[PDB]
Amino acid sequence: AEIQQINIVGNHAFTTDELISHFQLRDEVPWWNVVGDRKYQKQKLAGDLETLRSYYLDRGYARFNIDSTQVSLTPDKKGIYVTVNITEGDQYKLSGVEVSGNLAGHSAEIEQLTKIEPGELYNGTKVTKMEDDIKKLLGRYGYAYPRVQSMPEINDADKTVKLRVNVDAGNRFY
Amino acid sequence: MSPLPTVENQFTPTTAWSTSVGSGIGNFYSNLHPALADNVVYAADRAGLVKALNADDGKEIWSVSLAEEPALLSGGVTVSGGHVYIGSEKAQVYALNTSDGTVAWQTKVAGEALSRPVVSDGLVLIHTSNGQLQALNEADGAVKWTVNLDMPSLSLRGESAPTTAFGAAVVGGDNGRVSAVLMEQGQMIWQQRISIDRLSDVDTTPVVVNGVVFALAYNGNLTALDLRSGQIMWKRELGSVNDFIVDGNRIYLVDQNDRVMALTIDGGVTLWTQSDLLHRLLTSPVLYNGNLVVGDSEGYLHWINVEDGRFVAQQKVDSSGFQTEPVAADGKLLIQAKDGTVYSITR
Numbered sequence: 001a002e003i004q005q006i007n008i009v010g011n012h013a014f015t016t017d018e019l020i021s022h023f024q025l026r027d028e029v030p031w032w033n034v035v036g037d038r039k040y041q042k043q044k045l046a047g048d049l050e051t052l053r054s055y056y057l058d059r060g061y062a063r064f065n066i067d068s069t070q071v072s073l074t075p076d077k078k079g080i081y082v083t084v085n086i087t088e089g090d091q092y093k094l095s096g097v098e099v100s101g102n103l104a105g106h107s108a109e110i111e112q113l114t115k116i117e118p119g120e121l122y123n124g125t126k127v128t129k130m131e132d133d134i135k136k137l138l139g140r141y142g143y144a145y146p147r148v149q150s151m152p153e154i155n156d157a158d159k160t161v162k163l164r165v166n167v168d169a170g171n172r173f174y
Numbered sequence: 175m176s177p178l179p180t181v182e183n184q185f186t187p188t189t190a191w192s193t194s195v196g197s198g199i200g201n202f203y204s205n206l207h208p209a210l211a212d213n214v215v216y217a218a219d220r221a222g223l224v225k226a227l228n229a230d231d232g233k234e235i236w237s238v239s240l241a242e243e244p245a246l247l248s249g250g251v252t253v254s255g256g257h258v259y260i261g262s263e264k265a266q267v268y269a270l271n272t273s274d275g276t277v278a279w280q281t282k283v284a285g286e287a288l289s290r291p292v293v294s295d296g297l298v299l300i301h302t303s304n305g306q307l308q309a310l311n312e313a314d315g316a317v318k319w320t321v322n323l324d325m326p327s328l329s330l331r332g333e334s335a336p337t338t339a340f341g342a343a344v345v346g347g348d349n350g351r352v353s354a355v356l357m358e359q360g361q362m363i364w365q366q367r368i369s370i371d372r373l374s375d376v377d378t379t380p381v382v383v384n385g386v387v388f389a390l391a392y393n394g395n396l397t398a399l400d401l402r403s404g405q406i407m408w409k410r411e412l413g414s415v416n417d418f419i420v421d422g423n424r425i426y427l428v429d430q431n432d433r434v435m436a437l438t439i440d441g442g443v444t445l446w447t448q449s450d451l452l453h454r455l456l457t458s459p460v461l462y463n464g465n466l467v468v469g470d471s472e473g474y475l476h477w478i479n480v481e482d483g484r485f486v487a488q489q490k491v492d493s494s495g496f497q498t499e500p501v502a503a504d505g506k507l508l509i510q511a512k513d514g515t516v517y518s519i520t521r
C-alpha cells in the first residue's frame with residue numbers, strides 16, 4: 001500500500017507542504033529523486049515526528065507538542081493516510097543558562113561556553129550543540145564519558161526559557 | 175476483481191442529467207457525496223468548490239469556492255434547516271446558506287472532519303479522524319461538547335456518522351465499540367464492543383428501529399443492540415464499512431468483500447446472497463423504486479431485486495468510477511463519480 005496523504009493539523013506558522021518536505025515518508029515522489037517511494041514504514045514515521053519536533057524547537061517553539069498521530073488504511077487496503085495533530089504554542093526567548101553538577105573544576109571555561117546572545121530565541125539544536133561543546137571540553141581533560149542534561153524552565157508570562165543544565169564529568173581516563 | 179456479468183435488463187435506466195463539480199475527490203478515499211433538499215442538489219469537490227444545482231436539470235444555481243487552500247472538503251454534504259454542512263481534513267466545519275452559498279459560519283474542530291455531518295436537536299454532529307465526537311450549535315457553529323473515543327494503532331480511513339433517537343446519539347467507534355451519548359451535554363450513556371485482521375472499525379452509520387440499534391463492524395460483527403442499555407441481542411459474523419439498510423423486516427448490506435445480502439431483521443438470518451460483484455469495490459446500497467442500487471469502482475450502477483438478489487439492470491455511467499454513497503430521495507437517484515461529476519439517474 002502507498003501513502004495517499006501526509007497531513008498536519010494545527011500548523012499555522014508553516015505550511016503543511018514546507019513541513020513534510022523534510023520527511024522520509026512521502027505522499028508524493030518528487031521528479032528529482034528516483035529512489036524514493038510512497039511505502040509506509042513505522043520507523044520512518046517515528047523519525048519524521050522527531051524531524052517535525054526539531055523543526056519547531058529549533059525555531060523558538062518551546063511548548064511545541066505532537067498531540068496525536070493517526071495512521072489509517074483505506075478499505076481496499078491500497079492506500080495509507082498519515083495525520084499529525086500538533087499544538088505549536090508561541091515563540092520563546094532565552095533568558096539564561098544555569099550550569100550545575102560535577103564540573104571537575106572547569107566551571108569557568110564551561111560558563112564561557114554557555115553565553116547568551118542578547119534576545120536569543122530558544123533553539124533546541126543549539127542546546128544540544130552547547131551540551132556537546134561541554135562534553136568535548138571535559139574530554140580534553142580526560143573525562144571520556146561526561147553526561148549532560150538540559151531542562152528548559154519555561155516562563156509563559158515572559159515568553160522566556162531558562163536552561164538548567166546538569167553536568168556529570170564522570171570518570172577520568174588515562 | 176470479479177468481471178462484469180451479462181445482464182438482460184428488465185428496464186432501461188438512463189441518465190437524466192450530469193453536471194461536473196470541479197475535479198471531485200479523485201483517488202482520495204472519503205465521504206464527500208451529494209445532498210438533496212427541496213429540489214436542489216448540493217455537491218462539492220475536495221479542492222473547495224461547492225455548487226447548488228436545480229434537481230430537475232442539473233443547471234447551476236450558485237457556485238462558491240471554500241479555497242479562496244485547497245480546503246480538503248471531505249465529510250458531507252449534509253443539508254438541514256437552510257444550512258449546507260461540510261467537514262474538511264483541515265479540521266474545519268462549514269455551514270453555508272442554501273439560498274446563495276454564503277458562509278453562515280465556520281468552526282475549527284478537533285481533527286480531520288471525515289464523517290457525514292448529522293443534524294439533530296439543534297446540533298451538528300462531527301466525528302474526527304483523531305477520535306473525537308463533537309456537537310456544534312446549528313446557529314453559530316460553536317462547539318457545545320466533545321466526547322473522546324479510543325483510537326487503535328491502525329484503523330480504516332473514515333469515521334462513523336451517528337444516528338440519533340430519543341435525545342441520544344449512537345455512534346460507531348474505530349476500536350470496535352458502539353457508543354450512546356446524551357445529546358444535551360454529551361453524557362456517555364453506554365459503550366458496547368461488537369468486534370490488520372485485528373482491524374475492527376465501526377465506520378458504518380448505526381440504524382435505530384423500534385428500540386433496537388443495528389451496527390456493523392469491519393471484520394464482524396453485524397449486531398443488534400438494545401437501545402436503552404446497549405446489551406447485545408444477536409450477532410452475525412458479517413463485516414463492512416458500508417452503510418446498510420433496514421427496510422420492512424429486512425436488512426440489506428454490502429459486506430467488505432462486496433457480497434450483497436438480505437437478512438431477516440429478527441435474528442439476522444440470511445435470505446439471499448449475491449456474490450458476482452466480489453471485490454469490484456461497491457458503494458453502499460440505496461433503495462430506488464423497489465430495487466437495491468450500488469455503484470462500483472469501474473463506474474457501473476447495478477440494480478438488484480430485493481426479493482431474490484437477482485440483477486434486474488446494469489448501466490455504464492462514468493469512466494472515473496464510483497466510490498461515495500448514492501442518494502435516493504424525493505423521487506431522485508443521485509451519485510457522484512470520483513472525478514466529481516454528479517448524475518441524476520432515471521429508472
Ligand SMILES: [Ca+2]
Nearest residue numbers: 330332348375
Ligand atoms: Ca475508521
